Short mmCIF file of C-alpha atoms and ligand atoms in Angstrom, two decimals:
data_model
loop_
_atom_site.label_atom_id
_atom_site.label_comp_id
_atom_site.label_asym_id
_atom_site.label_seq_id
_atom_site.Cartn_x
_atom_site.Cartn_y
_atom_site.Cartn_z
CA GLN V 231 167.60 -26.48 -18.92
CA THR V 232 165.46 -27.34 -21.94
CA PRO V 233 169.25 -25.29 -24.84
CA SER V 234 167.52 -21.95 -24.36
CA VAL V 235 167.76 -21.09 -20.66
CA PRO V 236 170.63 -18.76 -19.79
CA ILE V 237 173.19 -20.20 -17.38
CA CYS V 238 172.53 -17.38 -14.89
CA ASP V 239 168.84 -18.36 -14.72
CA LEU V 240 169.87 -21.91 -13.82
CA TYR V 241 171.93 -20.75 -10.83
CA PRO V 242 169.83 -18.13 -9.03
CA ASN V 243 172.42 -17.26 -6.37
CA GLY V 244 174.94 -16.31 -9.06
CA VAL V 245 177.23 -19.11 -7.85
CA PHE V 246 178.45 -21.27 -10.74
CA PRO V 247 179.89 -24.78 -10.71
CA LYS V 248 183.64 -25.15 -10.34
CA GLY V 249 185.63 -27.03 -12.97
CA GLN V 250 188.06 -29.85 -12.11
CA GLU V 251 190.26 -28.78 -9.19
CA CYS V 252 193.79 -30.19 -9.02
CA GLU V 253 196.61 -29.92 -6.51
CA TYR V 254 199.74 -28.47 -8.13
CA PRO V 255 202.45 -30.86 -9.38
CA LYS V 256 196.76 -18.17 -0.01
CA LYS V 257 193.20 -19.23 0.80
CA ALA V 258 192.40 -15.61 1.61
CA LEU V 259 194.10 -14.49 -1.60
CA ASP V 260 192.13 -17.10 -3.55
CA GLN V 261 188.83 -15.99 -2.01
CA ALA V 262 189.55 -12.32 -2.74
CA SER V 263 189.24 -13.06 -6.47
CA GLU V 264 186.17 -15.27 -6.14
CA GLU V 265 184.08 -12.91 -8.28
CA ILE V 266 186.60 -13.43 -11.10
CA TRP V 267 186.73 -17.22 -10.88
CA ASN V 268 182.95 -17.18 -10.70
CA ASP V 269 182.66 -15.33 -14.02
CA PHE V 270 184.98 -17.85 -15.68
CA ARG V 271 182.78 -20.65 -14.36
CA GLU V 272 179.61 -19.04 -15.72
CA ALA V 273 181.28 -18.85 -19.13
CA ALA V 274 182.58 -22.43 -18.84
CA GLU V 275 179.14 -23.80 -18.01
CA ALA V 276 177.75 -22.06 -21.08
CA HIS V 277 180.61 -23.61 -23.06
CA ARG V 278 179.85 -27.09 -21.72
CA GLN V 279 176.15 -26.88 -22.56
CA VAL V 280 176.69 -25.42 -26.04
CA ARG V 281 179.21 -28.11 -27.05
CA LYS V 282 177.05 -30.92 -25.69
CA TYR V 283 174.24 -29.65 -27.91
CA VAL V 284 176.54 -29.31 -30.94
CA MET V 285 177.82 -32.89 -30.55
CA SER V 286 174.21 -34.10 -30.77
CA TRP V 287 173.46 -32.64 -34.21
CA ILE V 288 176.71 -31.92 -36.10
CA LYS V 289 176.62 -34.19 -39.17
CA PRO V 290 178.16 -34.47 -42.63
CA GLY V 291 175.81 -32.83 -45.14
CA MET V 292 175.45 -29.63 -43.09
CA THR V 293 177.12 -26.50 -44.44
CA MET V 294 179.87 -24.96 -42.32
CA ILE V 295 177.73 -21.82 -42.17
CA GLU V 296 174.71 -23.75 -40.85
CA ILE V 297 176.90 -25.34 -38.18
CA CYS V 298 178.45 -22.08 -36.97
CA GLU V 299 175.14 -20.19 -36.94
CA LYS V 300 173.37 -22.91 -34.96
CA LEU V 301 176.25 -23.07 -32.45
CA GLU V 302 176.52 -19.30 -32.10
CA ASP V 303 172.75 -18.93 -31.67
CA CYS V 304 172.90 -21.32 -28.73
CA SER V 305 175.98 -19.67 -27.23
CA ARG V 306 174.33 -16.24 -27.38
CA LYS V 307 171.23 -17.58 -25.64
CA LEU V 308 173.11 -19.41 -22.87
CA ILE V 309 175.66 -16.67 -22.17
CA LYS V 310 172.83 -14.12 -22.08
CA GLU V 311 174.69 -11.92 -24.54
CA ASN V 312 174.86 -8.33 -23.27
CA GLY V 313 177.13 -6.10 -25.35
CA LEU V 314 180.65 -6.33 -23.91
CA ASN V 315 179.50 -7.59 -20.49
CA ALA V 316 178.66 -11.08 -21.70
CA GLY V 317 178.99 -12.76 -25.10
CA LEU V 318 181.02 -14.67 -27.65
CA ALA V 319 184.73 -14.29 -26.98
CA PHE V 320 185.84 -15.12 -30.53
CA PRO V 321 184.47 -16.62 -33.76
CA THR V 322 183.57 -20.28 -34.12
CA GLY V 323 186.60 -22.08 -35.53
CA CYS V 324 185.61 -25.14 -37.58
CA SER V 325 188.89 -25.70 -39.40
CA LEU V 326 188.93 -28.75 -41.67
CA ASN V 327 191.46 -31.47 -42.40
CA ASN V 328 194.91 -29.97 -43.05
CA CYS V 329 193.65 -26.66 -41.69
CA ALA V 330 194.13 -26.60 -37.95
CA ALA V 331 192.88 -23.23 -36.79
CA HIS V 332 191.31 -19.87 -37.54
CA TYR V 333 188.84 -20.94 -40.23
CA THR V 334 185.19 -19.91 -39.95
CA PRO V 335 183.13 -19.43 -43.13
CA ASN V 336 182.56 -15.95 -44.56
CA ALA V 337 179.26 -15.14 -46.31
CA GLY V 338 178.76 -17.21 -49.46
CA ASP V 339 180.97 -20.13 -48.38
CA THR V 340 179.29 -23.27 -49.75
CA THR V 341 181.62 -25.71 -47.99
CA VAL V 342 179.76 -28.82 -46.79
CA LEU V 343 181.00 -31.01 -43.91
CA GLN V 344 181.97 -34.47 -45.20
CA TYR V 345 182.01 -37.95 -43.66
CA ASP V 346 185.82 -38.08 -43.94
CA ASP V 347 186.40 -34.57 -42.61
CA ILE V 348 188.28 -33.89 -39.37
CA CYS V 349 186.81 -30.66 -37.94
CA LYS V 350 188.23 -28.59 -35.09
CA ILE V 351 185.38 -26.88 -33.21
CA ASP V 352 187.06 -24.07 -31.29
CA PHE V 353 184.73 -21.49 -29.75
CA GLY V 354 184.71 -19.07 -26.84
CA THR V 355 182.40 -17.46 -24.29
CA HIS V 356 183.04 -14.66 -21.78
CA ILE V 357 181.47 -12.97 -18.78
CA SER V 358 182.98 -9.51 -18.10
CA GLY V 359 185.91 -10.29 -20.39
CA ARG V 360 186.75 -13.48 -18.44
CA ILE V 361 187.25 -15.78 -21.41
CA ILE V 362 186.76 -19.51 -21.77
CA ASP V 363 188.80 -20.78 -24.68
CA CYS V 364 188.07 -24.47 -25.30
CA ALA V 365 187.98 -26.81 -28.28
CA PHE V 366 187.46 -30.37 -29.46
CA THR V 367 187.74 -32.34 -32.71
CA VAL V 368 184.78 -33.79 -34.59
CA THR V 369 185.08 -36.84 -36.84
CA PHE V 370 182.66 -39.40 -38.33
CA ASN V 371 185.14 -41.96 -39.67
CA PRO V 372 186.82 -44.10 -36.98
CA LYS V 373 190.08 -44.13 -38.95
CA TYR V 374 191.04 -40.94 -37.09
CA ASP V 375 190.42 -42.35 -33.61
CA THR V 376 194.09 -42.80 -32.63
CA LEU V 377 195.03 -39.35 -33.90
CA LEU V 378 192.29 -37.84 -31.73
CA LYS V 379 193.38 -39.89 -28.73
CA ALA V 380 196.98 -38.76 -29.22
CA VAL V 381 196.07 -35.08 -29.13
CA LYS V 382 193.57 -35.46 -26.29
CA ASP V 383 196.31 -37.20 -24.29
CA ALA V 384 198.89 -34.54 -25.21
CA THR V 385 196.49 -31.80 -24.10
CA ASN V 386 195.76 -33.58 -20.81
CA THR V 387 199.51 -33.98 -20.26
CA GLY V 388 200.05 -30.26 -20.76
CA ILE V 389 197.21 -29.56 -18.33
CA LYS V 390 198.76 -31.88 -15.75
CA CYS V 391 202.28 -30.44 -16.10
CA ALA V 392 201.06 -26.85 -15.80
CA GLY V 393 201.41 -25.07 -12.47
CA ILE V 394 202.75 -22.10 -10.52
CA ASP V 395 206.52 -21.82 -11.05
CA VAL V 396 206.48 -24.38 -13.88
CA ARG V 397 208.72 -23.51 -16.83
CA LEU V 398 206.75 -23.12 -20.06
CA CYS V 399 209.47 -24.97 -21.98
CA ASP V 400 208.96 -28.00 -19.72
CA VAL V 401 205.25 -28.06 -20.51
CA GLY V 402 206.06 -28.09 -24.23
CA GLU V 403 208.61 -30.89 -23.85
CA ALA V 404 206.11 -33.03 -21.97
CA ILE V 405 203.36 -32.46 -24.54
CA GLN V 406 205.67 -33.45 -27.39
CA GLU V 407 206.87 -36.60 -25.63
CA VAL V 408 203.30 -37.88 -25.20
CA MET V 409 202.12 -36.74 -28.63
CA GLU V 410 205.01 -38.42 -30.42
CA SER V 411 204.49 -41.67 -28.52
CA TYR V 412 201.53 -42.28 -30.81
CA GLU V 413 201.59 -43.84 -34.26
CA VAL V 414 198.50 -43.96 -36.47
CA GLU V 415 197.38 -45.60 -39.68
CA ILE V 416 195.05 -43.77 -42.04
CA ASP V 417 194.09 -45.12 -45.45
CA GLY V 418 196.91 -47.67 -45.51
CA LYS V 419 199.66 -45.23 -44.56
CA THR V 420 201.35 -44.97 -41.16
CA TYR V 421 202.54 -41.88 -39.35
CA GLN V 422 204.13 -40.86 -36.06
CA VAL V 423 201.88 -38.05 -34.73
CA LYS V 424 203.69 -34.71 -34.69
CA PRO V 425 202.85 -31.62 -32.67
CA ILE V 426 202.36 -28.49 -34.81
CA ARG V 427 205.48 -26.65 -33.68
CA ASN V 428 204.41 -23.11 -34.61
CA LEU V 429 201.04 -23.42 -32.87
CA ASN V 430 200.71 -22.99 -29.10
CA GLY V 431 198.68 -22.45 -25.95
CA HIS V 432 198.78 -19.01 -24.32
CA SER V 433 198.02 -16.85 -21.32
CA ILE V 434 194.64 -15.14 -21.22
CA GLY V 435 193.94 -11.61 -19.95
CA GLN V 436 190.77 -9.56 -19.43
CA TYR V 437 189.20 -9.10 -22.88
CA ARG V 438 192.55 -10.42 -24.13
CA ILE V 439 192.58 -13.89 -25.72
CA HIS V 440 196.39 -13.76 -26.05
CA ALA V 441 197.89 -11.99 -23.04
CA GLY V 442 201.53 -12.34 -24.15
CA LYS V 443 202.89 -15.63 -22.78
CA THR V 444 202.87 -18.75 -24.98
CA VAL V 445 202.75 -22.45 -24.10
CA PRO V 446 204.86 -24.38 -26.62
CA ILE V 447 203.88 -27.87 -27.72
CA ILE V 448 207.41 -28.97 -28.60
CA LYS V 449 210.72 -28.90 -26.70
CA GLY V 450 213.12 -25.97 -27.10
CA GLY V 451 210.97 -23.10 -25.77
CA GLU V 452 211.54 -20.45 -23.10
CA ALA V 453 212.21 -21.21 -19.42
CA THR V 454 209.80 -18.41 -18.47
CA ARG V 455 207.64 -19.62 -15.59
CA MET V 456 203.88 -19.73 -15.13
CA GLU V 457 202.73 -17.49 -12.27
CA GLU V 458 200.13 -17.52 -9.53
CA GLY V 459 196.92 -15.84 -10.69
CA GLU V 460 197.54 -16.42 -14.41
CA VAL V 461 194.99 -18.00 -16.73
CA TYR V 462 196.08 -20.20 -19.62
CA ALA V 463 194.55 -21.78 -22.69
CA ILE V 464 196.27 -25.17 -22.91
CA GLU V 465 195.77 -26.40 -26.48
CA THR V 466 197.75 -28.90 -28.49
CA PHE V 467 197.59 -29.85 -32.15
CA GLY V 468 198.75 -33.10 -33.75
CA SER V 469 199.38 -33.53 -37.49
CA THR V 470 200.14 -36.23 -40.06
CA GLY V 471 201.83 -33.55 -42.19
CA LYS V 472 204.92 -31.37 -41.75
CA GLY V 473 203.91 -30.32 -38.24
CA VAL V 474 204.10 -26.69 -39.36
CA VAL V 475 201.29 -24.31 -40.34
CA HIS V 476 201.17 -21.50 -42.89
CA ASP V 477 198.55 -18.83 -43.65
CA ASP V 478 196.10 -20.11 -46.26
CA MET V 479 192.72 -19.38 -47.85
CA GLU V 480 190.50 -16.33 -47.33
CA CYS V 481 190.76 -14.54 -43.97
CA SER V 482 187.69 -14.52 -41.72
CA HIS V 483 189.06 -13.69 -38.25
CA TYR V 484 190.15 -10.23 -37.12
CA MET V 485 191.03 -8.58 -33.83
CA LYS V 486 191.97 -5.08 -32.72
CA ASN V 487 195.57 -4.70 -31.51
CA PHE V 488 195.21 -4.53 -27.72
CA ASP V 489 198.04 -2.00 -27.41
CA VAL V 490 196.79 0.49 -29.98
CA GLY V 491 195.17 3.49 -28.31
CA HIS V 492 192.74 6.04 -29.76
CA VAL V 493 193.26 6.93 -33.41
CA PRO V 494 191.31 9.78 -34.99
CA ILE V 495 189.95 8.71 -38.37
CA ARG V 496 188.26 11.00 -40.90
CA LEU V 497 187.71 8.52 -43.77
CA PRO V 498 183.99 7.96 -43.22
CA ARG V 499 183.59 4.25 -43.98
CA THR V 500 186.76 3.35 -42.06
CA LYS V 501 185.80 5.57 -39.13
CA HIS V 502 182.34 4.00 -38.98
CA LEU V 503 183.72 0.47 -39.10
CA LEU V 504 186.17 1.22 -36.27
CA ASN V 505 183.28 2.62 -34.22
CA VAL V 506 181.24 -0.56 -34.86
CA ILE V 507 184.21 -2.69 -33.80
CA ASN V 508 184.87 -0.65 -30.66
CA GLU V 509 181.18 -0.79 -29.66
CA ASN V 510 180.58 -4.48 -30.36
CA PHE V 511 183.92 -6.26 -29.90
CA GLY V 512 186.41 -3.92 -28.21
CA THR V 513 189.60 -6.03 -28.09
CA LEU V 514 187.74 -9.33 -28.59
CA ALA V 515 188.18 -11.17 -31.91
CA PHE V 516 185.38 -11.05 -34.49
CA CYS V 517 184.68 -12.41 -37.97
CA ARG V 518 183.09 -11.05 -41.17
CA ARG V 519 179.82 -12.92 -40.56
CA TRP V 520 179.45 -10.93 -37.33
CA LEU V 521 179.73 -7.64 -39.22
CA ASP V 522 177.12 -8.88 -41.71
CA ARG V 523 174.76 -9.75 -38.86
CA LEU V 524 175.02 -6.18 -37.56
CA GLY V 525 173.74 -4.99 -40.93
CA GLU V 526 177.14 -3.78 -42.12
CA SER V 527 178.00 -3.91 -45.84
CA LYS V 528 180.72 -2.54 -48.13
CA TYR V 529 183.15 -2.82 -45.25
CA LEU V 530 185.98 -4.89 -46.77
CA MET V 531 188.07 -1.90 -47.84
CA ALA V 532 187.48 -0.19 -44.48
CA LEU V 533 188.58 -3.42 -42.79
CA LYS V 534 191.70 -3.59 -44.95
CA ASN V 535 192.44 0.03 -44.06
CA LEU V 536 192.27 -0.72 -40.35
CA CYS V 537 194.56 -3.73 -40.87
CA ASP V 538 197.04 -1.68 -42.91
CA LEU V 539 196.99 0.97 -40.16
CA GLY V 540 197.86 -1.72 -37.61
CA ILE V 541 194.72 -0.91 -35.60
CA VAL V 542 193.23 -4.30 -36.47
CA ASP V 543 195.14 -7.53 -37.12
CA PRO V 544 194.04 -10.28 -39.53
CA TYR V 545 194.19 -13.92 -38.31
CA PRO V 546 193.98 -16.08 -41.43
CA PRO V 547 193.47 -19.85 -41.42
CA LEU V 548 196.55 -21.82 -40.37
CA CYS V 549 197.01 -25.01 -42.36
CA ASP V 550 199.57 -27.78 -42.71
CA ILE V 551 200.36 -29.31 -46.13
CA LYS V 552 197.64 -30.45 -48.52
CA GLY V 553 196.56 -34.03 -47.79
CA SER V 554 197.55 -33.92 -44.09
CA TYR V 555 195.22 -34.36 -41.10
CA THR V 556 195.24 -32.18 -37.98
CA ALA V 557 193.41 -32.48 -34.65
CA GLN V 558 193.02 -30.23 -31.60
CA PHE V 559 191.97 -30.35 -27.95
CA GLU V 560 191.92 -27.33 -25.69
CA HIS V 561 190.95 -26.23 -22.19
CA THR V 562 191.19 -23.09 -20.10
CA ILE V 563 192.86 -23.37 -16.69
CA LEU V 564 193.01 -21.01 -13.71
CA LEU V 565 196.21 -20.87 -11.64
CA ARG V 566 194.45 -20.05 -8.38
CA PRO V 567 196.37 -19.56 -5.14
CA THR V 568 195.07 -22.80 -3.58
CA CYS V 569 194.85 -25.06 -6.63
CA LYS V 570 194.79 -25.52 -10.40
CA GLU V 571 191.27 -25.42 -11.80
CA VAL V 572 190.51 -26.90 -15.24
CA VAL V 573 187.53 -24.58 -15.45
CA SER V 574 186.27 -25.77 -18.84
CA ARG V 575 186.57 -29.50 -18.05
CA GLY V 576 183.35 -31.43 -18.76
CA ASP V 577 182.14 -35.05 -18.63
CA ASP V 578 182.91 -35.09 -22.36
CA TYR V 579 186.59 -34.06 -22.44
C1 LIG F 687 192.06 -15.53 -33.32
S1 LIG F 687 190.58 -15.68 -32.35
C2 LIG F 687 190.49 -17.52 -32.31
C3 LIG F 687 191.44 -17.84 -31.12
C4 LIG F 687 191.42 -19.37 -30.87
N1 LIG F 687 190.26 -19.83 -30.17
C5 LIG F 687 192.67 -19.78 -30.16
O1 LIG F 687 192.47 -20.78 -29.34
O2 LIG F 687 193.79 -19.28 -30.18
ZN1 LIG F 688 190.83 -21.79 -28.94
ZN1 LIG F 689 193.64 -20.88 -27.61
#
């Protein structure tokens, strides 16, 4: 690697590095899905190399647009983007401060990253719809160090507790216990770190970032169990605020409802936009910048139409109260028959 060389060109035999393998808190069965695990690994390796590169240049002074474009450019090159066979699984989240998730700049956003900002870089790659969903928090001021450590620890605790037959509610209880064991001091004020209760991890399906099961990050959830063969995004969020998020700011993220089938549309602009979405994203999430890049314009009303029709769903930024600070750490795990693989694990986090 120079990053510019596609992951597949770095591993000629098409065999990609495994992530961290763990015994749980069939070998034939495991091997029968090797092509699947392999695709996840190719996407995870791209994820590892992209984030390593990002960590080397992300600095206050850069615009959020500059950051996302530079990251996405690298991701496209390393994943060897190929329509729906290989590409970006979802938009680059770079949510700031009290905003925890689902913020990526739309065209014209002049927001500049600041020294005191706490930025959640949450981005995804896929090979054949096998998605790697993984994220980390970026800071420049050491005052947030303990908050970051709390969340990193909570995420690692959820990863450790996960396993075949494990009750999702137990994973959430564990995460909360660790998260809340931390106390931090920021600008002369102290806080007990709180998990964002209405935010959660979730199962992953083919071309489906949210397959239907959720991994709570607080006690009180469902006793539904994790199952052999499932794939999960284990993410946790810690906050100095209310520990609850609400929709806020302009929406940038959108995604077709996985269950909606074919819908004949005669309105020309709306029909065309749906065609563009089906061709380029299918059921994968996208953002407005990605429509712009494809040369689309005057699409906002068509997009609203699709949302109002329930064909597409909006995913607006999720933020805690003004003045609060939020952090995130996330990994994708495979519940293979023989072991638990933290496929996106790196030497970084
Ligand atoms: C709504 S697409 C962005 C999804 C995000 N990466 C998540 O972890 O849930
Ligand atoms: Zn994510
Ligand atoms: Zn996720």
